[PDB]
Design a protein around this ligand. Sequence first.
Ligand SMILES: Cc1cc2nc3c(=O)[nH]c(=O)nc-3n(C[C@H](O)[C@H](O)[C@H](O)COP(=O)(O)O)c2cc1C
Ligand SMILES: [Mg+2]
Length: 375
Amino acid sequence: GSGFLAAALERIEKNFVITDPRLPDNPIIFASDSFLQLTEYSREEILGRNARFLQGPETDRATVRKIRDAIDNQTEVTVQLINYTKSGKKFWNLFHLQPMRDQKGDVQYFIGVQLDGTEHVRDAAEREAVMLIKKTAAEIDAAAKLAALKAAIEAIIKRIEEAEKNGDEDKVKELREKLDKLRRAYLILALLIAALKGQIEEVRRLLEQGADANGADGGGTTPLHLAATSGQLTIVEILLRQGADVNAADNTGTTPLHLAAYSGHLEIVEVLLKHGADVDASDVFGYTPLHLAAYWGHLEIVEVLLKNGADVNAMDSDGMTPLHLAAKWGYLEIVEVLLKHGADVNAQDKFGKTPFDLAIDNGNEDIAEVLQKAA
Ligand SMILES: Cc1cc2nc3c(=O)[nH]c(=O)nc-3n(C[C@H](O)[C@H](O)[C@H](O)COP(=O)(O)O)c2cc1C
Ligand SMILES: [Mg+2]
């Protein structure tokens, strides 16, 4: 167990567990009440155990290895697998692993969100749920991050009272300069969470009280990046009125407009471009918002992005255009709309591949046909 996490994450009420990778076998150190309900095991029967108890016979051993690979490689993963309750009642798990990292970027804990379904969901319904569990794990991370900052404040306030009572002014002078940075950072994260959760009055209040509208976490995330990812037009507009940088880039070169194209929030994209967003801004991998629109199945956003200056033949780090990503993931309607707006069918990726090659390689037999016909 762990009393620190217990306090911060007690209000979430979604199925999730936190595990300690520093202890043998990554045991569960916190389990939500919703998880406890879903699985039927008590908190005592769960804590200190590796979460593989939920596994059973109809559980795809190949999908389980995808999770071992993600834990081992310390990356996030979203999979769908059959899980079993304490009783033996089978149920579908849309599972999301997310490493909890510190400011130096090192893993501290693992977050595991579970979304119970009666059947293996697919296509737009899978994408709708995957976006939602990703947003849940993002909030569990921020809830712990804020709780950690609150704790540091109460701790230095405690040290301040002792040093004041000890006479020692040199210590108080020195402690107050550290507190003045914890307070500084607390409001930066308070505003980052307010945009993420869509709390319009919290956003106005913090900015009204002095919060920097461009204050970013250690990773480069500004409130405008989180408001864009969430689908909060009002907060976006409030942040842009209060002079926020519409072309801000995080440690990964991602701009609010990349996150708006990835999340499928059409209205936000239009407002960001209406305020000076670079339609051809490229992240560390070379993806422009057009590449993110194409890979994620956002039909509507591509038509708007191209109308503002998007290069329909943009090359990511592996020489792939939007016309490539459309055919690899088998989104039929997307390849048609992309090719319509003059996209190169004979475009050379790193392996010299063209849309048709990545369509026959991935089994998409309809797509590969509306490529040799549509050429
Ligand atoms: C935070 C966290 C939550 C987990 N939740 C589940 C879960 O809901 N269901 C499941 O079957 N495995 C879950 N796992 C994965 C397993 O614990 C384990 O990593 C997996 O079975 C692969 O490793 P193994 O082959 O040693 O079992 C979770 C792991 C972590 C890190
Ligand atoms: Mg494990």
